[PDB]
Design an enzyme around this catalytic site. Sequence first.
Site, PDB file in Angstrom:
ATOM      1  N   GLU A 283      -7.018  -4.520  -6.601  1.00  0.00           N
ATOM      2  CA  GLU A 283      -7.152  -4.179  -5.208  1.00  0.00           C
ATOM      3  C   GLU A 283      -7.560  -5.291  -4.282  1.00  0.00           C
ATOM      4  OE1 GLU A 283      -9.882  -1.011  -4.204  1.00  0.00           O
ATOM      5  OE2 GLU A 283      -9.557  -1.366  -2.067  1.00  0.00           O
TER       6      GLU A 283
ATOM      7  N   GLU B 149      -6.249  -2.109 -10.943  1.00  0.00           N
ATOM      8  CA  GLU B 149      -5.588  -1.926  -9.675  1.00  0.00           C
ATOM      9  C   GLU B 149      -5.361  -3.173  -8.863  1.00  0.00           C
ATOM     10  OE1 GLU B 149      -7.511   1.189  -7.490  1.00  0.00           O
ATOM     11  OE2 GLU B 149      -7.076   2.652  -9.091  1.00  0.00           O
TER      12      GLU B 149
ATOM     13  N   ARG C   6       0.793  -1.210   0.000  1.00  0.00           N
ATOM     14  CA  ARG C   6       0.000   0.000   0.000  1.00  0.00           C
ATOM     15  C   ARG C   6       0.837   1.277   0.000  1.00  0.00           C
ATOM     16  NH1 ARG C   6      -4.584   2.554   0.720  1.00  0.00           N
ATOM     17  NH2 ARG C   6      -4.562   4.486   1.963  1.00  0.00           N
TER      18      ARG C   6
ATOM     19  N   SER D 117      -7.220   0.311   0.883  1.00  0.00           N
ATOM     20  CA  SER D 117      -6.712  -0.281  -0.338  1.00  0.00           C
ATOM     21  C   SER D 117      -5.249  -0.786  -0.279  1.00  0.00           C
ATOM     22  CB  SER D 117      -6.839   0.780  -1.429  1.00  0.00           C
ATOM     23  OG  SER D 117      -6.330   0.332  -2.653  1.00  0.00           O
TER      24      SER D 117
END
Lengths: 36, 186, 98, 98, 98, 98, 98
Positions: free
Chosen positions: B109, B107, B5, B58
């Site tokens: 995520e 992404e 992150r 995230s």
Amino acid sequence: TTCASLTNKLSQHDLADFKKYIKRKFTLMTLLSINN
Amino acid sequence: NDYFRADSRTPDEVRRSGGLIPRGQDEAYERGTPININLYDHARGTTGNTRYNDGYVSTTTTLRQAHLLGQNMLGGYNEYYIYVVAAAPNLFDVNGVLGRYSPYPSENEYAALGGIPLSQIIGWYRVSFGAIEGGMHRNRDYRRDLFRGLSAAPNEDGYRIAGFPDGFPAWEEVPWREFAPNSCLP
Amino acid sequence: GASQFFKDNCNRTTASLVEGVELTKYISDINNNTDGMYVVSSTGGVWRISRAKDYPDNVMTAEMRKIAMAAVLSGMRVNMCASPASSPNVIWAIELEA
Amino acid sequence: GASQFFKDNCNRTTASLVEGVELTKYISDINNNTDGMYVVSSTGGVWRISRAKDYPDNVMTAEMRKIAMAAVLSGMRVNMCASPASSPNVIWAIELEA
Amino acid sequence: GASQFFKDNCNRTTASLVEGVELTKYISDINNNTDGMYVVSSTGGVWRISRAKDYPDNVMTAEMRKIAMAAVLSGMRVNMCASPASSPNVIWAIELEA
Amino acid sequence: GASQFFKDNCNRTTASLVEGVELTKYISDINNNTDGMYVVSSTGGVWRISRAKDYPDNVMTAEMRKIAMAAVLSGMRVNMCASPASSPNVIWAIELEA
Amino acid sequence: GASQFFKDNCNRTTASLVEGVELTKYISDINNNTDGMYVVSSTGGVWRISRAKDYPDNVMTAEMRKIAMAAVLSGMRVNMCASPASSPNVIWAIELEA
């Protein structure tokens, strides 16, 4: 309850459970370390 | 597995917060809670940090990608950090839980429910001027005995808390219909 | 690093002060030759933990094993005061640090 | 803060009540000169942990060690009732607070 | 709350049952006046754990001490069967519940 | 993998070195015929942990059990030096690797 | 489910194998009537843990209490081998599953 509220509510329960899980696992490793 | 992150908060701030907490929580990790948790709303949320709105924080799957995301949402900061996080069931595969409805599939995520506790943070890299300055600084509060061999939460557990709005198409489709909270089914 | 107390107590002895060690292996061995408890640092350093049959040293040596176990599991560092007289070096004092 | 109960039992003795301490080091030392069990606070204060061989105190001091070590491992604060006579001060009672 | 088995056993004796107790402090005291092991609840209750030198009870009281500590460390609730004969009440039976 | 110290120690004996094993089961059996403590690996393999009544091996065996259980509870692998002279093989030395 | 090894061991005895139980309560009772250590499953089922003053069973039964405590805190599953004779049923072998 609304869809939102119930989602939040269910989510909060999941979190609380995870946090308890970590506390109990930590506690367990600690008692194993400090006990004779 | 490790997740990464890019965050604008300094290791000292994280220590004081007890971890990387969501934007809506004012107390240390173990003390407070996000005021509202919703995976769907969170994945869509756009300020001064990488996605951490709506009760989730995230993370992504590689250093390279966390870095790219850093340069993208945190470009403008002279310095920020990339936290290395151990796998655990508080991490949900956004693309896997939201299916085709995943807003930013690029992404990759992995949403951390309620944030990431300090003991889960393995270490961090300092990014000065867009460049990774040196090696990873090992987090002394990382507890390997607590995280060894854990993995992210299975998608099934996430379907129930996907959080799509009421009457959203997903609530009438498999797999979500089979796990939807009562008040969300049409 | 070691507390001033720990540093000073060790310096008053013939043993060496090893600071900020990361233990990653805990050994229990009953083979007739190498009968004892040992710890290994992330760098390959090996120390023997001391044992004492009688009170009060059995209390202290029991706590050393607890400290070694705790350090290996959690990753917390230790500062040791080890006697080089034997190989591996014996631990005479150990400090668990957070 | 220390339980009302704790504040009272300690103030009934010659020891001082030290509260909300954050233990950071746990020490086991068998060097004859410094032989003992000690804890160091985040501010550098040092204390000796009592010991006793006979029942019932052998039980209370054993728990005293576990309380001290669980405090270093967890970061939980403690309240102590320590005697100023010796140096380092001796812990006569300890309260682990969640 | 208390399991039926636990509930039955206590209500068989003269002791009181206490349920859903949140223990927040664990105490070890050797000061002769207040010599013993104690626990304080989030509401302000104070109980003391039972001690026993001989078998089989020495085992139960030790387990009793592990449970109390597990409770203070984890936040897990306990149910107790405490005798109101003393002040603080002595715990004759305790149940840890996940 | 097994530290050099551990390999060399095991290779000095008649036992065999078993590296990087994951313990998934922990058994305590008092049934009179299978009386003992065993561990089962992820690969189904079974081993018995040595026991001992006298000093100092009663300390090394106690730590062996503590190491076995910590491996089971955390998923941390272990290296072993076991005697193939029995079935199940008996553990003569164990090393917890973090 | 239990290991083949654990299963075959329980088979050669009177006890009844009980697979995949989840212990949720841990009890320590010293009351005259109910003197003993017990565990309670999620389903409301109750068992009693064996105790022994003599060696080497004092070792095995102590490992049982440790296994019980771990299961209750970890939510990990166990498989027992209990004798249907007494009430509550008595655990004669236990297996912690990771």
